[PDB]
mmCIF file of N, CA, C and O in Angstrom:
data_model
loop_
_atom_site.group_PDB
_atom_site.id
_atom_site.type_symbol
_atom_site.label_atom_id
_atom_site.label_comp_id
_atom_site.label_asym_id
_atom_site.label_seq_id
_atom_site.Cartn_x
_atom_site.Cartn_y
_atom_site.Cartn_z
ATOM 1 N N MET A 2 64.531 108.900 95.697
ATOM 2 C CA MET A 2 65.404 108.216 96.810
ATOM 3 C C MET A 2 66.024 108.957 97.898
ATOM 4 O O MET A 2 66.092 110.126 97.844
ATOM 5 N N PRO A 3 66.144 108.292 99.149
ATOM 6 C CA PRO A 3 66.660 108.913 100.219
ATOM 7 C C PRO A 3 68.210 109.463 100.112
ATOM 8 O O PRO A 3 68.921 108.809 99.518
ATOM 9 N N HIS A 4 68.537 110.482 100.898
ATOM 10 C CA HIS A 4 69.819 110.970 100.752
ATOM 11 C C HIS A 4 70.357 110.375 102.148
ATOM 12 O O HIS A 4 69.611 109.679 102.834
ATOM 13 N N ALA A 5 71.662 110.756 102.696
ATOM 14 C CA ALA A 5 72.011 110.705 103.922
ATOM 15 C C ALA A 5 71.430 111.689 104.884
ATOM 16 O O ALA A 5 70.671 112.553 104.374
ATOM 17 N N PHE A 6 71.321 111.355 106.137
ATOM 18 C CA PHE A 6 70.800 112.320 107.112
ATOM 19 C C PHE A 6 71.560 113.721 107.173
ATOM 20 O O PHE A 6 72.811 113.696 107.130
ATOM 21 N N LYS A 7 70.814 114.705 107.200
ATOM 22 C CA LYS A 7 71.397 116.029 107.328
ATOM 23 C C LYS A 7 70.620 116.894 108.381
ATOM 24 O O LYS A 7 69.657 116.552 108.762
ATOM 25 N N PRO A 8 71.482 117.904 109.069
ATOM 26 C CA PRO A 8 70.885 118.693 110.039
ATOM 27 C C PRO A 8 69.567 119.229 109.658
ATOM 28 O O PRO A 8 69.577 119.588 108.451
ATOM 29 N N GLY A 9 68.499 119.139 110.495
ATOM 30 C CA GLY A 9 67.231 119.561 110.128
ATOM 31 C C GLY A 9 66.194 118.533 109.884
ATOM 32 O O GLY A 9 65.012 118.849 109.829
ATOM 33 N N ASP A 10 66.755 117.290 109.790
ATOM 34 C CA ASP A 10 65.872 116.156 109.403
ATOM 35 C C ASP A 10 65.110 115.753 110.793
ATOM 36 O O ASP A 10 65.733 115.926 111.751
ATOM 37 N N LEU A 11 63.770 115.559 110.596
ATOM 38 C CA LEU A 11 63.097 115.057 111.689
ATOM 39 C C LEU A 11 62.843 113.558 111.757
ATOM 40 O O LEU A 11 62.765 112.866 110.818
ATOM 41 N N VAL A 12 62.954 113.065 113.000
ATOM 42 C CA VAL A 12 63.032 111.519 113.146
ATOM 43 C C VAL A 12 62.276 111.105 114.323
ATOM 44 O O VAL A 12 61.929 112.071 115.144
ATOM 45 N N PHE A 13 62.009 109.839 114.459
ATOM 46 C CA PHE A 13 61.938 109.171 115.743
ATOM 47 C C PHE A 13 63.213 108.602 116.139
ATOM 48 O O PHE A 13 63.841 107.951 115.076
ATOM 49 N N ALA A 14 63.840 108.932 117.210
ATOM 50 C CA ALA A 14 65.121 108.360 117.533
ATOM 51 C C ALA A 14 64.988 107.291 118.720
ATOM 52 O O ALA A 14 64.280 107.506 119.754
ATOM 53 N N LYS A 15 65.586 106.109 118.590
ATOM 54 C CA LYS A 15 65.347 104.938 119.420
ATOM 55 C C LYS A 15 66.616 104.812 120.351
ATOM 56 O O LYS A 15 67.739 104.567 119.889
ATOM 57 N N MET A 16 66.358 105.090 121.640
ATOM 58 C CA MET A 16 67.231 104.842 122.755
ATOM 59 C C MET A 16 66.924 103.558 123.444
ATOM 60 O O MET A 16 65.732 103.212 123.565
ATOM 61 N N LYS A 17 67.822 102.870 124.151
ATOM 62 C CA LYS A 17 67.619 101.695 124.843
ATOM 63 C C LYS A 17 66.770 102.008 126.080
ATOM 64 O O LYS A 17 67.199 103.056 126.696
ATOM 65 N N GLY A 18 65.637 101.364 126.101
ATOM 66 C CA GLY A 18 64.820 101.660 127.374
ATOM 67 C C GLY A 18 63.809 102.731 127.116
ATOM 68 O O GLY A 18 62.897 102.895 127.934
ATOM 69 N N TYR A 19 63.908 103.666 126.054
ATOM 70 C CA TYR A 19 62.890 104.447 125.842
ATOM 71 C C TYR A 19 62.212 104.247 124.592
ATOM 72 O O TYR A 19 62.649 103.497 123.834
ATOM 73 N N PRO A 20 60.833 104.662 124.459
ATOM 74 C CA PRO A 20 60.187 104.170 123.141
ATOM 75 C C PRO A 20 60.807 105.249 122.028
ATOM 76 O O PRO A 20 61.375 106.247 122.399
ATOM 77 N N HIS A 21 60.431 104.876 120.735
ATOM 78 C CA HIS A 21 60.747 105.744 119.736
ATOM 79 C C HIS A 21 60.403 107.207 120.196
ATOM 80 O O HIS A 21 59.231 107.418 120.506
ATOM 81 N N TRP A 22 61.313 108.015 119.973
ATOM 82 C CA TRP A 22 61.160 109.537 120.502
ATOM 83 C C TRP A 22 61.390 110.597 119.475
ATOM 84 O O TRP A 22 62.212 110.564 118.601
ATOM 85 N N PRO A 23 60.410 111.552 119.426
ATOM 86 C CA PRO A 23 60.424 112.757 118.412
ATOM 87 C C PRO A 23 61.706 113.542 118.699
ATOM 88 O O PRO A 23 62.062 113.944 119.785
ATOM 89 N N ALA A 24 62.416 113.747 117.474
ATOM 90 C CA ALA A 24 63.710 114.416 117.633
ATOM 91 C C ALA A 24 64.024 114.978 116.217
ATOM 92 O O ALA A 24 63.334 114.978 115.334
ATOM 93 N N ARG A 25 65.307 115.544 116.106
ATOM 94 C CA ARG A 25 65.710 116.138 114.959
ATOM 95 C C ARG A 25 67.295 115.962 114.917
ATOM 96 O O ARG A 25 67.931 115.817 116.035
ATOM 97 N N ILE A 26 67.849 115.993 113.777
ATOM 98 C CA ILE A 26 69.320 116.040 113.610
ATOM 99 C C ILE A 26 69.759 117.512 113.798
ATOM 100 O O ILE A 26 69.169 118.427 113.139
ATOM 101 N N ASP A 27 70.597 117.836 114.857
ATOM 102 C CA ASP A 27 70.893 119.016 115.119
ATOM 103 C C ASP A 27 72.268 119.388 114.252
ATOM 104 O O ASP A 27 72.933 118.534 113.744
ATOM 105 N N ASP A 28 72.553 120.748 114.047
ATOM 106 C CA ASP A 28 73.703 121.291 113.579
ATOM 107 C C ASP A 28 74.661 121.156 114.918
ATOM 108 O O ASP A 28 74.317 121.302 115.991
ATOM 109 N N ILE A 29 76.058 121.018 114.536
ATOM 110 C CA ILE A 29 77.073 121.416 115.517
ATOM 111 C C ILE A 29 77.386 122.943 115.488
ATOM 112 O O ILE A 29 77.643 123.280 114.327
ATOM 113 N N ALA A 30 77.173 123.619 116.441
ATOM 114 C CA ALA A 30 77.547 125.029 116.584
ATOM 115 C C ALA A 30 79.065 125.136 116.609
ATOM 116 O O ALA A 30 79.723 124.332 116.963
ATOM 117 N N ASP A 31 79.485 126.463 116.081
ATOM 118 C CA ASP A 31 80.856 126.629 116.201
ATOM 119 C C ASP A 31 81.347 126.430 117.655
ATOM 120 O O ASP A 31 80.932 126.935 118.504
ATOM 121 N N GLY A 32 82.407 125.551 117.726
ATOM 122 C CA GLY A 32 83.185 125.433 119.041
ATOM 123 C C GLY A 32 82.455 124.502 120.102
ATOM 124 O O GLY A 32 83.168 124.279 121.133
ATOM 125 N N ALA A 33 81.428 123.910 119.650
ATOM 126 C CA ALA A 33 80.690 122.997 120.300
ATOM 127 C C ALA A 33 81.273 121.510 120.103
ATOM 128 O O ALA A 33 81.910 121.299 118.993
ATOM 129 N N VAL A 34 81.093 120.597 120.903
ATOM 130 C CA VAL A 34 81.681 119.138 120.877
ATOM 131 C C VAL A 34 81.024 118.586 119.630
ATOM 132 O O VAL A 34 79.775 118.598 119.541
ATOM 133 N N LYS A 35 81.951 117.812 118.955
ATOM 134 C CA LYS A 35 81.460 117.008 117.752
ATOM 135 C C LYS A 35 81.089 115.640 118.185
ATOM 136 O O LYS A 35 81.636 115.029 119.109
ATOM 137 N N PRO A 36 80.143 114.992 117.481
ATOM 138 C CA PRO A 36 79.857 113.663 117.825
ATOM 139 C C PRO A 36 80.917 112.699 117.336
ATOM 140 O O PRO A 36 81.580 113.055 116.433
ATOM 141 N N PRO A 37 81.052 111.526 117.832
ATOM 142 C CA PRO A 37 81.974 110.472 117.277
ATOM 143 C C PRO A 37 81.697 110.319 115.734
ATOM 144 O O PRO A 37 80.627 110.560 115.295
ATOM 145 N N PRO A 38 82.760 109.729 115.126
ATOM 146 C CA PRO A 38 82.435 109.264 113.699
ATOM 147 C C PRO A 38 81.312 108.437 113.453
ATOM 148 O O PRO A 38 80.903 107.510 114.224
ATOM 149 N N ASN A 39 80.540 108.671 112.360
ATOM 150 C CA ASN A 39 79.214 107.909 111.899
ATOM 151 C C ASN A 39 78.122 108.208 112.944
ATOM 152 O O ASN A 39 77.128 107.542 112.950
ATOM 153 N N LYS A 40 78.244 109.106 113.929
ATOM 154 C CA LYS A 40 77.203 109.582 114.831
ATOM 155 C C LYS A 40 76.686 110.846 114.469
ATOM 156 O O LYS A 40 77.394 111.760 113.848
ATOM 157 N N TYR A 41 75.416 111.170 114.762
ATOM 158 C CA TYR A 41 74.753 112.491 114.492
ATOM 159 C C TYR A 41 74.302 112.987 115.846
ATOM 160 O O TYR A 41 73.924 112.279 116.823
ATOM 161 N N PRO A 42 74.392 114.217 116.114
ATOM 162 C CA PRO A 42 73.910 114.840 117.344
ATOM 163 C C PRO A 42 72.386 114.762 117.332
ATOM 164 O O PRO A 42 71.833 115.438 116.285
ATOM 165 N N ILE A 43 71.666 114.275 118.225
ATOM 166 C CA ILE A 43 70.205 114.249 118.077
ATOM 167 C C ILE A 43 69.614 114.964 119.227
ATOM 168 O O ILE A 43 69.904 114.705 120.410
ATOM 169 N N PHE A 44 68.726 115.976 118.942
ATOM 170 C CA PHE A 44 68.192 116.755 119.954
ATOM 171 C C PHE A 44 66.680 116.244 120.107
ATOM 172 O O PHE A 44 65.919 116.083 119.125
ATOM 173 N N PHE A 45 66.271 115.927 121.310
ATOM 174 C CA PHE A 45 65.111 115.118 121.652
ATOM 175 C C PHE A 45 64.090 116.182 121.992
ATOM 176 O O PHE A 45 64.300 117.014 122.974
ATOM 177 N N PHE A 46 63.087 116.390 121.252
ATOM 178 C CA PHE A 46 61.810 117.104 121.617
ATOM 179 C C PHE A 46 61.331 116.871 122.984
ATOM 180 O O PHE A 46 61.396 115.714 123.308
ATOM 181 N N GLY A 47 60.870 117.842 123.738
ATOM 182 C CA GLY A 47 60.290 117.662 124.928
ATOM 183 C C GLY A 47 61.100 117.759 126.071
ATOM 184 O O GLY A 47 61.267 118.462 127.062
ATOM 185 N N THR A 48 62.110 116.780 126.124
ATOM 186 C CA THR A 48 63.154 116.573 127.038
ATOM 187 C C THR A 48 64.343 117.686 126.855
ATOM 188 O O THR A 48 64.975 117.996 127.770
ATOM 189 N N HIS A 49 64.451 118.090 125.632
ATOM 190 C CA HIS A 49 65.423 119.008 125.075
ATOM 191 C C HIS A 49 66.794 118.367 125.436
ATOM 192 O O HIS A 49 67.598 119.248 125.783
ATOM 193 N N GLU A 50 66.967 117.130 125.326
ATOM 194 C CA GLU A 50 68.394 116.601 125.612
ATOM 195 C C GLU A 50 69.095 116.067 124.321
ATOM 196 O O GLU A 50 68.323 115.813 123.446
ATOM 197 N N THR A 51 70.450 116.072 124.304
ATOM 198 C CA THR A 51 71.162 115.448 123.156
ATOM 199 C C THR A 51 71.834 114.188 123.487
ATOM 200 O O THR A 51 72.476 114.045 124.567
ATOM 201 N N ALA A 52 71.571 113.186 122.590
ATOM 202 C CA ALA A 52 72.620 112.053 122.455
ATOM 203 C C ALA A 52 73.166 112.013 121.054
ATOM 204 O O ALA A 52 72.747 112.743 120.153
ATOM 205 N N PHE A 53 74.263 111.151 120.969
ATOM 206 C CA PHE A 53 74.785 110.757 119.669
ATOM 207 C C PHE A 53 74.281 109.390 119.270
ATOM 208 O O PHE A 53 74.213 108.433 120.039
ATOM 209 N N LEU A 54 73.774 109.323 118.076
ATOM 210 C CA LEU A 54 73.153 108.114 117.499
ATOM 211 C C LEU A 54 73.510 107.860 116.078
ATOM 212 O O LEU A 54 73.610 108.900 115.288
ATOM 213 N N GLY A 55 73.734 106.680 115.665
ATOM 214 C CA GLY A 55 73.873 106.243 114.303
ATOM 215 C C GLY A 55 72.449 106.004 113.604
ATOM 216 O O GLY A 55 71.523 106.093 114.225
ATOM 217 N N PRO A 56 72.434 106.023 112.206
ATOM 218 C CA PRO A 56 71.162 105.799 111.482
ATOM 219 C C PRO A 56 70.268 104.582 111.953
ATOM 220 O O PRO A 56 69.121 104.650 111.661
ATOM 221 N N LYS A 57 70.848 103.457 112.404
ATOM 222 C CA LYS A 57 70.022 102.246 112.848
ATOM 223 C C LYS A 57 69.024 102.697 113.953
ATOM 224 O O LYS A 57 67.930 102.105 114.153
ATOM 225 N N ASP A 58 69.285 103.876 114.575
ATOM 226 C CA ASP A 58 68.469 104.439 115.645
ATOM 227 C C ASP A 58 67.433 105.476 115.268
ATOM 228 O O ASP A 58 66.645 105.829 115.911
ATOM 229 N N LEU A 59 67.521 105.749 113.863
ATOM 230 C CA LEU A 59 66.920 107.054 113.482
ATOM 231 C C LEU A 59 65.870 106.698 112.425
ATOM 232 O O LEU A 59 66.063 106.025 111.309
ATOM 233 N N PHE A 60 64.588 107.136 112.764
ATOM 234 C CA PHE A 60 63.391 106.690 111.947
ATOM 235 C C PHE A 60 62.741 108.054 111.483
ATOM 236 O O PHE A 60 62.297 108.852 112.180
ATOM 237 N N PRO A 61 62.872 108.179 110.060
ATOM 238 C CA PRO A 61 62.242 109.349 109.473
ATOM 239 C C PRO A 61 60.906 109.582 109.881
ATOM 240 O O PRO A 61 60.043 108.713 109.919
ATOM 241 N N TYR A 62 60.646 110.909 110.199
ATOM 242 C CA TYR A 62 59.369 111.301 110.931
ATOM 243 C C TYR A 62 58.099 111.113 109.954
ATOM 244 O O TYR A 62 57.181 110.565 110.522
ATOM 245 N N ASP A 63 58.240 111.451 108.617
ATOM 246 C CA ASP A 63 57.105 111.637 107.696
ATOM 247 C C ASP A 63 56.371 110.132 107.903
ATOM 248 O O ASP A 63 55.258 110.007 108.074
ATOM 249 N N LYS A 64 57.229 109.074 107.616
ATOM 250 C CA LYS A 64 56.962 107.671 107.397
ATOM 251 C C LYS A 64 56.640 107.017 108.713
ATOM 252 O O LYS A 64 55.918 105.963 108.706
ATOM 253 N N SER A 65 57.030 107.519 109.844
ATOM 254 C CA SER A 65 57.050 106.709 111.015
ATOM 255 C C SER A 65 56.112 107.350 112.067
ATOM 256 O O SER A 65 55.744 106.628 113.062
ATOM 257 N N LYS A 66 55.334 108.526 111.701
ATOM 258 C CA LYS A 66 54.615 109.063 112.673
ATOM 259 C C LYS A 66 53.250 108.430 113.032
ATOM 260 O O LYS A 66 52.842 108.554 114.153
ATOM 261 N N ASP A 67 52.766 107.622 112.054
ATOM 262 C CA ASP A 67 51.542 106.958 112.185
ATOM 263 C C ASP A 67 51.802 105.839 113.311
ATOM 264 O O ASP A 67 51.002 105.427 114.116
ATOM 265 N N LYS A 68 53.071 105.300 113.307
ATOM 266 C CA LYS A 68 53.412 104.142 114.232
ATOM 267 C C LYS A 68 53.764 104.826 115.651
ATOM 268 O O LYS A 68 53.429 104.111 116.659
ATOM 269 N N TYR A 69 54.307 106.074 115.645
ATOM 270 C CA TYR A 69 55.120 106.375 116.887
ATOM 271 C C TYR A 69 54.579 107.696 117.376
ATOM 272 O O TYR A 69 54.909 108.049 118.523
ATOM 273 N N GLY A 70 53.898 108.529 116.542
ATOM 274 C CA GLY A 70 53.407 109.743 117.047
ATOM 275 C C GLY A 70 52.053 109.690 117.784
ATOM 276 O O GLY A 70 51.143 110.514 117.536
ATOM 277 N N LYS A 71 52.136 108.756 118.791
ATOM 278 C CA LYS A 71 50.891 108.623 119.569
ATOM 279 C C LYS A 71 51.425 108.959 121.116
ATOM 280 O O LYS A 71 52.527 108.914 121.372
ATOM 281 N N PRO A 72 50.473 109.479 121.912
ATOM 282 C CA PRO A 72 51.045 109.987 123.255
ATOM 283 C C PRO A 72 51.522 108.963 124.188
ATOM 284 O O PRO A 72 51.228 107.724 123.925
ATOM 285 N N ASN A 73 52.176 109.362 125.138
ATOM 286 C CA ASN A 73 52.975 108.434 125.894
ATOM 287 C C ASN A 73 53.087 108.891 127.377
ATOM 288 O O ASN A 73 53.413 110.185 127.447
ATOM 289 N N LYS A 74 53.140 108.158 128.405
ATOM 290 C CA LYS A 74 53.261 108.489 129.744
ATOM 291 C C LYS A 74 54.656 109.268 129.888
ATOM 292 O O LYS A 74 54.603 110.142 130.758
ATOM 293 N N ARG A 75 55.643 108.905 129.161
ATOM 294 C CA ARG A 75 57.015 109.325 129.405
ATOM 295 C C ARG A 75 57.151 110.943 129.649
ATOM 296 O O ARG A 75 56.654 111.594 128.742
ATOM 297 N N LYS A 76 57.930 111.281 130.568
ATOM 298 C CA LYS A 76 58.324 112.674 130.866
ATOM 299 C C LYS A 76 58.733 113.369 129.581
ATOM 300 O O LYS A 76 59.806 112.880 129.144
ATOM 301 N N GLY A 77 58.089 114.402 129.032
ATOM 302 C CA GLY A 77 58.755 115.209 128.046
ATOM 303 C C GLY A 77 58.054 114.777 126.675
ATOM 304 O O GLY A 77 58.126 115.609 125.713
ATOM 305 N N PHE A 78 57.403 113.723 126.569
ATOM 306 C CA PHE A 78 57.115 113.009 125.324
ATOM 307 C C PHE A 78 55.972 113.789 124.683
ATOM 308 O O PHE A 78 56.007 113.971 123.477
ATOM 309 N N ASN A 79 54.930 114.173 125.339
ATOM 310 C CA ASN A 79 53.839 114.808 124.683
ATOM 311 C C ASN A 79 54.249 116.230 124.172
ATOM 312 O O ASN A 79 53.727 116.736 123.205
ATOM 313 N N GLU A 80 55.018 116.849 125.048
ATOM 314 C CA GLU A 80 55.578 118.161 124.697
ATOM 315 C C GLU A 80 56.337 117.909 123.403
ATOM 316 O O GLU A 80 56.181 118.684 122.460
ATOM 317 N N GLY A 81 57.099 116.883 123.338
ATOM 318 C CA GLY A 81 57.995 116.418 122.309
ATOM 319 C C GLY A 81 57.179 116.319 121.087
ATOM 320 O O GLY A 81 57.616 116.848 120.025
ATOM 321 N N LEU A 82 55.916 115.755 121.228
ATOM 322 C CA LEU A 82 55.100 115.522 120.009
ATOM 323 C C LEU A 82 54.621 116.844 119.506
ATOM 324 O O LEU A 82 54.511 117.003 118.210
ATOM 325 N N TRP A 83 54.223 117.755 120.263
ATOM 326 C CA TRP A 83 53.811 119.066 119.867
ATOM 327 C C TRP A 83 54.850 119.871 119.214
ATOM 328 O O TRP A 83 54.641 120.427 118.105
ATOM 329 N N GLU A 84 56.130 119.726 119.667
ATOM 330 C CA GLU A 84 57.189 120.448 119.109
ATOM 331 C C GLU A 84 57.458 120.042 117.685
ATOM 332 O O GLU A 84 57.641 120.805 116.811
ATOM 333 N N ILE A 85 57.454 118.785 117.489
ATOM 334 C CA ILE A 85 57.994 118.208 116.269
ATOM 335 C C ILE A 85 56.849 118.609 115.077
ATOM 336 O O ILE A 85 57.220 118.686 114.013
ATOM 337 N N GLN A 86 55.587 118.652 115.453
ATOM 338 C CA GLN A 86 54.447 118.862 114.616
ATOM 339 C C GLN A 86 54.420 120.241 114.375
ATOM 340 O O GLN A 86 54.065 120.650 113.181
ATOM 341 N N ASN A 87 54.681 121.165 115.342
ATOM 342 C CA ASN A 87 54.217 122.555 115.383
ATOM 343 C C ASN A 87 55.374 123.478 115.202
ATOM 344 O O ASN A 87 55.188 124.604 114.860
ATOM 345 N N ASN A 88 56.597 123.146 115.609
ATOM 346 C CA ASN A 88 57.630 124.050 115.485
ATOM 347 C C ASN A 88 59.078 123.344 115.568
ATOM 348 O O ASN A 88 59.921 123.776 116.388
ATOM 349 N N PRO A 89 59.310 122.329 114.770
ATOM 350 C CA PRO A 89 60.410 121.532 114.927
ATOM 351 C C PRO A 89 61.810 122.068 114.768
ATOM 352 O O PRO A 89 62.870 121.659 115.151
ATOM 353 N N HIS A 90 61.936 123.296 114.205
ATOM 354 C CA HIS A 90 63.202 123.894 114.042
ATOM 355 C C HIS A 90 63.338 125.219 114.762
ATOM 356 O O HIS A 90 64.340 125.948 114.503
ATOM 357 N N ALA A 91 62.636 125.398 115.878
ATOM 358 C CA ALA A 91 62.886 126.466 116.732
ATOM 359 C C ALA A 91 64.195 126.260 117.561
ATOM 360 O O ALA A 91 64.741 125.180 117.580
ATOM 361 N N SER A 92 64.668 127.326 118.022
ATOM 362 C CA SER A 92 65.732 127.283 119.124
ATOM 363 C C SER A 92 65.116 126.954 120.607
ATOM 364 O O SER A 92 64.129 127.742 121.040
ATOM 365 N N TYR A 93 65.286 125.792 121.067
ATOM 366 C CA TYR A 93 64.825 125.403 122.433
ATOM 367 C C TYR A 93 65.923 125.468 123.443
ATOM 368 O O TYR A 93 65.759 125.048 124.492
ATOM 369 N N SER A 94 66.877 126.275 123.063
ATOM 370 C CA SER A 94 68.099 126.394 123.954
ATOM 371 C C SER A 94 67.527 126.665 125.410
ATOM 372 O O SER A 94 66.598 127.413 125.571
#
């Protein structure tokens, strides 16, 4: 059975106006800004941007990649695809 989302989890994350996007639940580093309650900091592969998102927007990677892991015109997306597949846990600082 599924647990709650934990930092390190790979997802497609859905933002308004963007397609399901390859991402990861990040850790909060010491002294860095904390997300609102019931939000997770999401690092988006390719764009390397952070938003805060609840679970309704978070699609587990393993299960969703057949639907969503296909290339896309969008800036950063294909880079995004490569990162999540090939090195999802690197520092892209």
